[PDB]
Write a protein that holds these residues in place. Structure first.
Motif, PDB file in Angstrom:
ATOM      1  N   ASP A   9      48.037  29.673  43.111  1.00 46.19           N
ATOM      2  CA  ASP A   9      47.171  30.722  42.543  1.00 46.19           C
ATOM      3  C   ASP A   9      47.464  30.494  40.935  1.00 46.19           C
ATOM      4  OD1 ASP A   9      46.275  31.981  44.984  1.00 46.19           O
ATOM      5  OD2 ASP A   9      48.288  33.027  44.938  1.00 46.19           O
TER       6      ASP A   9
ATOM      7  N   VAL B 156      47.451  29.192  37.368  1.00 45.98           N
ATOM      8  CA  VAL B 156      46.387  28.525  36.364  1.00 45.98           C
ATOM      9  C   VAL B 156      47.684  27.332  35.721  1.00 45.98           C
ATOM     10  CG1 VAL B 156      44.839  28.345  34.651  1.00 45.98           C
ATOM     11  CG2 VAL B 156      44.976  30.170  36.353  1.00 45.98           C
TER      12      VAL B 156
ATOM     13  N   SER C 289      42.158  26.405  38.170  1.00 44.63           N
ATOM     14  CA  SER C 289      42.210  27.720  38.756  1.00 44.63           C
ATOM     15  C   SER C 289      41.989  28.027  40.346  1.00 44.63           C
ATOM     16  CB  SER C 289      41.863  29.031  37.789  1.00 44.63           C
ATOM     17  OG  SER C 289      42.236  30.352  38.269  1.00 44.63           O
ATOM     18  N   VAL C 290      41.715  29.150  40.833  1.00 43.17           N
ATOM     19  CA  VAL C 290      41.657  29.575  42.129  1.00 43.17           C
ATOM     20  C   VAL C 290      40.289  28.722  42.776  1.00 43.17           C
ATOM     21  CG1 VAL C 290      41.353  31.251  44.068  1.00 43.17           C
ATOM     22  CG2 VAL C 290      42.564  31.907  41.758  1.00 43.17           C
TER      23      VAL C 290
END
Ligand code: NAG
Ligand code: NAG
Lengths: 318, 116, 318, 116
Positions: free
Chosen positions: B31, B33, B52-53
């Motif tokens: 999760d 970054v 990111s996600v």
């Protein structure tokens, strides 16, 4: 008369506004000619009401606006947006609101969908998710909407109260929203401030102040708290006994009930003891009604029919 | 806890390619970054790209169409693929990780990239 | 008195039932001791009301029940169900209703979710789709629900009016429903009559008979059709002029409005001219209310606050 | 318009396998259901298996765990994979297609399957 009717209405509104604000009298204030950052909060709240009209509860709620954070490439901030062809990620910084977490009543996510005249498909279903920490499920569904990708620009709004409520109590759980295409083809809806970057995406947080923090008129309240004020009253209709009717086979009767009692113009409920809607002449009437099913015959043929607004379930002063 | 080691830098000619990699020593969550900053000598740190996600990405306007960030979550490694290199890309490139807060808190010591 | 109040209520109900059925008098009928296939229709309609209560319009609607077709392996019928780990397909035969397509008002899809104590995940979001003919999109989203897979058995219901409306006009477009797991892991919810095969899945179709087929009290109707009967009336509140208030900065005023006029106990609207809710003493009151945003100061600090139930948008007789 | 040709039948020993196939000559929509019936001599047609939207299937209780229906939409062919064959499966097997109505309207001439 339209004379006293209007004045009694104005006067009820006077007390209604002060009561809803928990003020005993108007606050004796500047009269300037106001920062546009303050007007923007009011403008967005008003506009959201006008949009939702294009289709605790009583006390006033304070409104706070939280814009998508600006990104400075020289600063060490993580960008507020991330991009895939199928979805968008947007994160708000709501840390300044953590001290008010217990006062949150509702939160709206407001984002402007831009017109995409080059959109391949003309309609798309888009879904809003709350991103979760992980291992475990990585996102929680919030809501979905069908959008016309090529249509003229429009504001969209989502109820994100649960997600913001969690973000305010646990900063470590603020991983932002995911705006995703519904897949049972790329995302063709475009959003101001997310794609290509007045129409900045923002949150509208509605709070009940602690000083204001310090029972509907239904069967549960009224039948256990007998009172002379406006309240639900029991009434059972026996079709045969009370109407002389023998053509209805089912039901033999039902609790239609009714609303009766005093409604003041100025275990207690405020919906019974004040004039919450600021009526010029309050009257005790039904608020919520329910349908009734009946089975009857017109000879050999059975008829099952549903009749609306037959059973009174709650009352209000109006 | 969290440690970042960059590599793959060097001196290239304009128009050529170069691949940077950043190995994350400590514990990093998928999760979390990761991204890249670049600092020309004297000038300040400049955002380049981040991931990111859902392998979602964010790129600075100057590297769009030329740079690609990718991530091997199994080995906790992020890569920066640099094609169509320009003299403007000459800087020291630092990889960054999200600190536990929505800011980059962990930094590797950086690798030089020079474009002729 | 609770004397005339109850009798006037009973008598209003007498006319309300007959009026909603478009009958001038009770139909002079058998008094048997009724096929269970007829009671099942009534039982399902009543039960659906009780379930939706666990949270055209006036005239009565006739209810028809359409069960999942039985499958005979010796007959040449295609089975009504098909199975994949991620979804279920269920098709109803609604051909007997095609002659009534123009009378359809609402259709509900009612299916019993069985308890699956062996379910791996305890909550699942399930989606209902209408299957379409193909090339083109192959399904149309209808609705979704979160279900507790291991919880005790429960009835679920979906509004499928649009899909059934299409099936009745175009038999060739009846490809059934798809009950699918929401995927942004197999389907772990189980359904009676679908999986493992009283709780048969069925459709409830609500129809307005042609003989019954032969305007809300809002600004659009009331302000263009001035009348003495109960109707919306305009009223603008100027905070400074009418209340002497100068502490509210925005808005300078608003159209709070009000409801006024006669409500009879027994370009016209029926909500104005009859007693639709069968009140013992009908009174003209507000039906739909809207909030109001205000911007005021208590010194230097701006306050943007939202107040509920401030603007009257429509009226009713009650 | 629509024509069905079955093949792959034969005489096998109990416990063995057999694969049936039904080639669809005319025009059939991928939305159209296809399936298999079987008729022991003298007795009447018996539903065996059918395939529908999203390769969804429906099987008779007697062939569950042993038969597999599959479909090649590109060639308009449906297959019936018969494992763990029993004498009870001895019959003439007919493939069927949905007629334009929710009933099987098109039938091939059938292939024999005998299980010793
Ligand atoms: C707020 O709305 C008013 C009325 O539409 C408009 O004149 C004004 O420019 C707006 N101001 C801001 C800051 O949005
Ligand atoms: C209908 O409901 C009543 C009351 O619950 C019950 O006694 C009766 O057995 C039900 N009959 C059918 C056919 O469902």
């Amino acid at each position: 008369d339209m004379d006293q009717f209007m004045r009694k209405r104005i006067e009820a509104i006077r007390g209604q506004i002060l009561s809803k604000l928990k003020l005993t009298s108007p606050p004796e204030y500047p009269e300037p000619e106001v920062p546009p950052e303050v007007i923007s909060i009011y403008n967005s709240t008003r506009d959201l009401l006008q949009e939702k009209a294009s289709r605790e509860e009583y006390y006033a709620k304070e409104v706070y606006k939280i814009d998508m954070p600006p990104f400075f490439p020289s600063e060490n901030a993580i960008p507020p947006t991330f991009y895939r062809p199928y979805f968008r990620i947007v994160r708000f910084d709501v840390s300044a609101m953590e001290k008010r977490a217990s006062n949150l009543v509702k939160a709206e996510f407001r984002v402007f969908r831009l017109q995409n005249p080059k959109a391949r498909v003309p309609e798309q279903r888009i879904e809003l998710y709350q991103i979760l920490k992980s291992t475990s499920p990585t996102q929680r569904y919030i809501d979905s909407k069908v959008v016309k990708t090529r249509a003229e620009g429009e504001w969209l709004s989502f109820d994100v109260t649960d997600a913001v409520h969690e973000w305010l109590h646990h900063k470590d759980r603020n991983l932002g929203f995911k705006i995703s295409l519904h897949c049972p083809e790329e995302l063709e809806a475009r959003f101001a401030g997310i794609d290509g970057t007045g129409k900045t995406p923002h949150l509208l947080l509605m709070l009940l102040p602690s000083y204001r923090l310090e029972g509907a008129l239904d069967a549960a309240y009224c039948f256990r708290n007998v009172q002379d004020n406006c309240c639900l009253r029991p009434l059972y209709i026996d079709f045969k006994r009370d109407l002389g009717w023998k053509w209805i086979h089912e039901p033999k009767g039902y609790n239609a009930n009714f609303c009766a009692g005093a409604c003041p113009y100025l275990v207690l409920s405020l919906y019974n003891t004040i004039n919450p809607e600021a009526s010029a002449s309050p009257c005790c009437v039904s608020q919520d009604l329910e349908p009734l099913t009946i089975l009857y015959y017109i000879g050999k043929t059975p008829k099952i029919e549903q009749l609306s607004n037959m059973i009174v379930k709650s009352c209000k002063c109006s | 806890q969290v440690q970042l080691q960059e590599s793959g830098g060097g001196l290239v000619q304009a128009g050529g390619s170069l691949r940077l990699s950043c190995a994350a020593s400590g514990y990093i969550s998928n999760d979390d970054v990761m991204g890249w900053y670049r600092q020309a000598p004297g000038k300040e740190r400049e955002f380049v790209a981040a991931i990111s996600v859902g392998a979602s990405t964010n790129y600075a306007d100057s590297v769009k169409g030329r740079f690609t960030i990718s991530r091997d979550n199994a080995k906790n490694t992020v890569y920066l693929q640099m094609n169509s290199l320009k003299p403007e890309d000459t800087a020291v490139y630092y990889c960054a990780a999200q600190s536990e807060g929505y800011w980059f808190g962990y930094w590797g010591q950086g690798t030089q990239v020079t474009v002729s």
